[PDB]
Amino acid sequence: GDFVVVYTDGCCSSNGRRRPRAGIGVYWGPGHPLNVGIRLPGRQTNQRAEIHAACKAIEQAKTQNINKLVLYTNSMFTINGITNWVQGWKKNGWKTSAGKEVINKEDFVALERLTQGMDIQWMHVPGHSGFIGNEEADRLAREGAKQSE
Template sequence: MKDDPDHAGSLDIEGLDSIRHMEVSRGSGLVLPTVFVPPPSATPQSLSPAGIGRNGHPPVTRFIRVDDPKSFLICTDGACLGNGQVEPKAGWTSVFGPLEQNTNASVNERLEHQSPLGDFAHPTSNRAELRATIGALRYRNWASEGFTTLVLATDSEYVVKGATEWIRAWLRKGWRKSDGAVLWKIPREWNTEADRLAKEGAQLDEELTFKERMGISP
């Protein structure tokens, strides 16, 4: 990703048909997100307004690209209350449809102390942001809804640069320091609903071990 706040990344998700049964594993680098560069002055709402996806069964309400009915957008965010302090609490969210129309259009949770691979770490803002993107990718079998491209809109530079630039160095070092998606670095003021839900997630009951969240309804 570039430093430009209006850049995003995308990933071909046709290979996610079996996401619900896919084992959690460390990334190999065979598939990496690409950079999405929107038109000047474009916003997530103007490029991907709420619409009915009719390529899957049943039809679903998603943020669908105006010029590509097989591409849709998910807003993600992570929040850490007391970041860097003694007892921080973090939460994450993914918003994949208009909240006023569909009560199942988002998921928000407390950030676990355990990573998907089993190691433990203190809650931080960066961990919460990364957890939100993992949650978005694994929440549903998006390809079964007829979509081939997923755009992840985030206000986290750490997520954007990590997934599109720094990841290559991490891979070379064996991760000592995935999928079919595009990342879009958006201004924080474009992500207010996700920010609110992530902070709500931080107030939920404490989670020690990693908990998979997958949706079963449209």
């Protein structure tokens, strides 16, 4: 069907440091009203931000009755999580290959739920490689990290 391209990014200043500040960015295009850069609530990490930037884009897509999404992110962790690992985790009790608990289980659960009824082409952006959509999403993510949660 007709697909729509969206660029997502999760960022986190001071990732792994004493005062991390995580933000999500979702870019639909120049001057698109759904473009957002907002603060990530909860645990402040880059991995959570990258997951919930994709979450936000999908929820926004649903509010527009869009069920075919070309979703760009630079997070292979998010992409491989949602297209591969989640199926294994629902079957094995959300255990990593080291036999440990999946740290961001509740975020992958939430994302897994949002992909229901969606046809999503998950795309890795090569990360700093001329894709202005990625740069615009990154900029919005940084803006959101400055805001309050």
